């Protein structure tokens, strides 16, 4: 009601890359494609919220 408006003109996605050595970033790539090296995460709140 108070006349506040917002208008989103453009948007871009950015991504910072660590320049890892290609025979090291391929060993880490190969290690992280196992079923045993799955990157497992957990929500910090860890709660179902009603």
């Amino acid at each position: 009601v108070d006349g506040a408006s917002i208008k989103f003109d453009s948007i871009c996605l950015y991504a910072t890359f660590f320049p890892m050595a290609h025979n090291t970033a391929s060993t880490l790539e190969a290690m992280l494609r196992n079923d045993t090296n799955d990157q497992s995460f957990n929500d910090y709140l860890s709660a179902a919220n009603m």
Binding site: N42, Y44, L45, S46, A47
Partner: peptide
């Protein structure tokens, strides 16, 4: 993997073994 570690002196400055995963939650 001592060629990836910085050298404090002539020994590789490695981390600890058991400091790999996270365990923090909302009070636990």
């Amino acid at each position: 993997f001592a060629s990836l570690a910085p050298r404090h002196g002539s020994r590789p400055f490695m981390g600890n073994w058991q400091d790999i995963g996270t365990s923090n939650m909302s009070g636990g």
